[PDB]
Structure 1
Amino acid sequence: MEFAFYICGLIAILATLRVITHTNPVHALLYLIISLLAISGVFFSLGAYFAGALEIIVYAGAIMVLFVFVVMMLNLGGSEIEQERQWLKPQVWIGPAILSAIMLVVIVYAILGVNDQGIDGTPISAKAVGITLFGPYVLAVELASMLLLAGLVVAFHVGREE
């Protein structure tokens, strides 16, 4: 169980790093799919089967429309990759790299300072998540439905051609 979690975590880290430092949009989307598959594998190793199930179910459709928009605008041959290459320079990425590194080491210092007892890996079924979702957490569900409705209304209002 440790092996699957650690291999999926390493794959997720590598695929995210390849995502943020790539010029090809379709290859970046493929590595993003790989990273989210690895994230769902991490979820499955921790016993949260529903979390990994929703990570593959709803993000396969999310990156699908990302592919649709990439085909819609970004694909132009080598010109788009060449234009994306000029925006990335050694100073340009070395600027915020040390900021991300110092933030990461501060958060790691924070993480290591807490007590630990180990994750037992006991599976949590979708039945318990459904009971808690429609039980103690009513208003989260209802106002999340209203939030998604609001986002849908915003998408309709902005995304019209004419």
Structure 2
Amino acid sequence: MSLLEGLALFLLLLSGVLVVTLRNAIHAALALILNFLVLAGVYVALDARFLGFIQVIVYAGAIVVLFLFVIMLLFAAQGEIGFDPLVRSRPLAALLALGVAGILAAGLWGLDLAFTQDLKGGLPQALGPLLYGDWLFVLLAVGFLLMAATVVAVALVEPG
């Protein structure tokens, strides 16, 4: 737990800080990939394992690779061009950032929960009957969402 746990959560926050900070888009996205690795690790430590592995495969493997393809296909690595920096906004942007943590912090403060259930590690073995099961409708809805997504995305490009 805490020995490495501190380390892993620290690495998470650090990574996020990078992805929001670095004005190299590639560097950014890549930092987010690092993030997804650590996050998947923490998922597993948190007894969610399958979700961790799909997190790497889809989120890290697929999604951000499509992203990377986009920023490689369009350049944009040097995002900060043509400006309207409106610098008076950076500390105001940073200000608002602090607050959304504060409000969540408060709601989670003085909150104790029973983080003890025998999840048995979130292997898909026990997840399947939920997926096709209680969540089957949510699933089919999702699938439909994906189909609609593909046709949308296709008509969205489709120069003619």
Asked if Structure 1 and Structure 2 have the same fold, meaning a TM-score greater than 0.5 normalized by the shorter chain, the answer is yes
* Contact 1:4-1:45 within 8 A present in 2 as well: no
**Aligned runs of 1:80-119 on 2, under 5 Å?**
80-81=78-79, 83=81, 86=83, 88=85, 90-119=87-116
Change (3 A) 1:115 1:140: same
Contact 1:133 1:141 in 2 (8 A): yes
Residue of structure 2 equivalent to 1:127:
125
**Alpha-carbon offset, residue 136 of structure 1:** 2.0
Residue 30 (structure 1) aligns with: 30
**In 1, Cα distance between the equivalents of 2:13 and 2:85?**
21
Match of 1:52 in 2: 52
Decide whether the 8 Å contact of 2:51 with 2:122 is kept in 1: no
1:74-131 per-position Cα deviation (integer Å, ceiling 9, x unaligned): 257xxx35517x4556532211221121221111010013233345675232111111
For structure 1, the 5+ residue unaligned runs are none
1:21-42 CA-partner distances (Å, limit 9, x unpaired): 1111111111010111111111
Sequence identity percentage: 22
Question: Which amino acid is the alignment partner of residue 112 of structure 2?
Answer: N
- Which structure has the highest helix share of the two? 1
Q: Deviations over 1:3-36 (max 9, x none)?
A: 4433222111111111111111111111010111
List alignment gaps of at least 5 residues for structure 2: none
User: AA paired with 1:17?
Assistant: V
Is residue 2:69 matched to residue 1:68?
A: yes
Please tell me whether the aligned partners of residues 46 and 122 of structure 1 are also in contact (alpha carbons under 8 angstroms). Answer: no
What is the rounded CA distance, in whole Å, between the counterparts of 2:116 and 2:3 in structure 1?
14
Q: Distance in 2 between matches of 1:19 and 1:108?
A: 22
Q: What is the distance in 2 between the residues matched to 1:81 and 1:153?
A: 30
